[PDB]
């Protein structure tokens, strides 16, 4: 009657923020085989489901998300296990008697060295052709890593091509997707929806420029953890993607040297053709419209009438000062001083960048591991969409005058924050009690 009674309810729409173990999904594309193990991954539902939670307002937070911290390690653990059964090149740390490449600042070295054959007696006087950045002299040269860490050559049957990974949550959990067209990753979300799996994001690991990502809606989106703090990177997302074309015009040769029983190191043979360096092209017309479109969104945070300047990287390492990424199998390191050479106030071919290549790349954020990128045969040429920008701000003491922006970002989590800004993990608790004038039997 007037005295209500407790009544248990099962299957109530109640959730709280939590963290758990997310799993994968990767379509059913026919195939083979790559680094990011799309193999033992669960296929994607052919007809995905998305339920728009009407009237629901939820507070998201892209900077304190766990999917980013979880995907960051999954990719590292993916690259780790993929290199485990592959060749180890400890016999390659031998004195390299090098010389300039055959041409007419060399950027290449024709190095000869002794090498262990299949037998444990006679040696092998075989030559190779390593890049300038993968070899350092000593008073003759040596592989750059040898004083720092051991090396492991990637098997040439695995592919470095990123294919989409769908992150999902197990039973009892759900992932929420904020679907408003103007959202800076933090704060309450007006229009929210639930999904079991995120959309297919490709684990592209780039720097300065963010490639093959998703596009923002309407206006270009700007996201930062603390705009007033110049020690935090500012992630940018484009509405219209700029076209970028990279190529390595060097028809290389793959010399298959045999080291010991079974193992086989792949060297660089004689180059067929001209000695042309790698580069990337960006249309001057599109980049002039995109940079002017981002600075219009920057004035909404630093006064309406202010001056914004762009400059290249200052202090930094190699894999951060240069637009570092993978394009066809080789690892390019492109000079971005031609893209951030601008100065905007309050109100016809392409742009080429001198790219350099490394075969010995070091593990990001760890002490003693480096891998050998096997040489690719053929003139490499990839086409990509630059859809984002990792930018930093120089903390000038004379503030509120003119602000300068410089790129960077040698941390993979920013490459994952760029596509996990619209997702967060919650746990469903279906046990809910409620009062009503309902009593059971005697």
């Amino acid at each position: 009657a007037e005295n209500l009674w407790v009544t248990v309810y099962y299957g109530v729409p109640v959730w709280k923020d939590a963290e758990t173990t997310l799993f994968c999904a990767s379509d059913a594309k026919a195939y083979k085989h790559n680094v990011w193990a799309t193999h033992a991954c669960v296929p994607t539902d052919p007809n995905p489901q998305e339920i728009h939670l009407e009237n629901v307002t939820e507070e998201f937070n892209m900077w304190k998300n766990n999917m980013v911290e979880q995907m960051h390690t999954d990719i590292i653990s993916l690259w780790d296990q993929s290199l485990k059964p592959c060749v180890k090149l400890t016999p390659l740390c031998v004195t390299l008697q090098c010389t300039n490449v055959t041409n007419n600042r060399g950027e290449l070295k024709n190095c000869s060295f002794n090498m262990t054959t299949e037998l444990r007696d006679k040696k092998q006087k075989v030559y190779s052709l390593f890049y300038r950045l993968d070899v350092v002299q000593i008073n003759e040269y040596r592989l750059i890593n040898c004083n720092t860490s051991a090396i492991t050559q990637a098997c040439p049957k695995v592919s470095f091509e990123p294919i989409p990974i769908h992150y999902c949550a197990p039973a009892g959990f759900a992932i929420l997707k904020c679907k408003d067209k103007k959202f800076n990753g933090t704060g309450p979300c007006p229009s929210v929806s639930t999904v079991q799996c995120t959309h297919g994001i490709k684990p592209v690991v780039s720097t300065q420029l963010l490639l093959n990502g998703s596009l923002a809606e309407e206006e270009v989106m700007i996201r930062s953890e603390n705009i007033t703090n110049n020690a935090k990177n500012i992630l940018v997302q484009f509405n219209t993607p700029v076209q970028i074309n990279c190529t390595r015009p060097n028809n290389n040769t793959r010399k298959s040297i045999r080291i010991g029983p079974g193992q086989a190191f792949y060297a660089t043979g004689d180059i067929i053709g001209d000695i042309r360096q790698a580069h990337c092209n960006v249309s001057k017309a599109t980049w002039n419209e995109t940079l002017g479109k981002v600075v219009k969104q920057l004035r909404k945070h630093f006064g309406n009438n202010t001056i914004i300047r762009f400059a290249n990287s200052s202090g930094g390492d190699l894999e951060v000062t240069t637009h570092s990424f993978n394009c066809g199998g080789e690892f390019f390191y492109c000079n971005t001083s031609g893209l951030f050479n601008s100065t905007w106030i309050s109100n016809n071919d392409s742009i080429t960048l001198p790219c350099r290549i490394k075969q010995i790349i070091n593990m990001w954020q760890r002490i003693g591991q480096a891998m050998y990128a096997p040489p690719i045969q053929g003139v490499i040429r990839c086409v990509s969409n630059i859809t984002g920008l990792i930018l930093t701000r120089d903390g000038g003491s004379t503030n509120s005058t003119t602000e300068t922006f410089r790129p960077g970002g040698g941390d993979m989590r920013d490459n994952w924050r760029s596509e996990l800004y619209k997702y967060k993990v919650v746990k469903i608790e279906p046990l809910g009690v409620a009062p009503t004038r309902c009593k059971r039997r005697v």
Partner: antibody
Amino acid sequence: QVHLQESGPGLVKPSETLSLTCNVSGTLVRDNYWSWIRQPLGKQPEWIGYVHDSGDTNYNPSLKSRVHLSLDKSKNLVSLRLTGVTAADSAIYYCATTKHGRRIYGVVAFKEWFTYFYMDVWGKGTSVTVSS
Amino acid sequence: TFVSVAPGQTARITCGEESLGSRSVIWYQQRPGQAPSLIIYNNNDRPSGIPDRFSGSPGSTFGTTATLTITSVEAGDEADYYCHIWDSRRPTNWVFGEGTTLIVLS
């Protein structure tokens, strides 16, 4: 028409200095490039070096420290010098105009090209014998 | 080196080493007792006064020697043929390649 004529001594003692002259008729010595070519008997021709105004002059790396070219704009003729001659310098020295070219293979901006030359209008040629 | 071709046929002449990069081969013809003349500059580009019967191998092939093709062979073409190799991988050649004399038979 362009008529080039070489004229020199034709006989130079060993360890001396050769002095040749290419009398130009048909065009100016300033608005064109000039090159000298020698050829021993029964051998292939050998390039000696090109000469042009504004100090654009290069020498043969094998004959660098001995040859000295010049252009006489007031007299409209090409000159040549060769100090310290030996028996291997006995050849037929020619005089020819030179037209430059630019062969592009890369991306132009990265200096991925090279400048090639070719002589189109030769001369009648002079004969120079080295003996004591 | 001597190569002979029956009159009216097509002639082939090899000069210089094998190509290491993009080339711009210059061909010359030396009449016996006369001065050498320019035949084909820039691999396969003929100036004014040279018929289309002469064609050189393109300098876009990587791994082949400089080939000089002479269609419709006549007794007047019996002379020496030298080449000037301009290679992007090799330094400037100040000595012409060893020539090849064309012999008109019949």
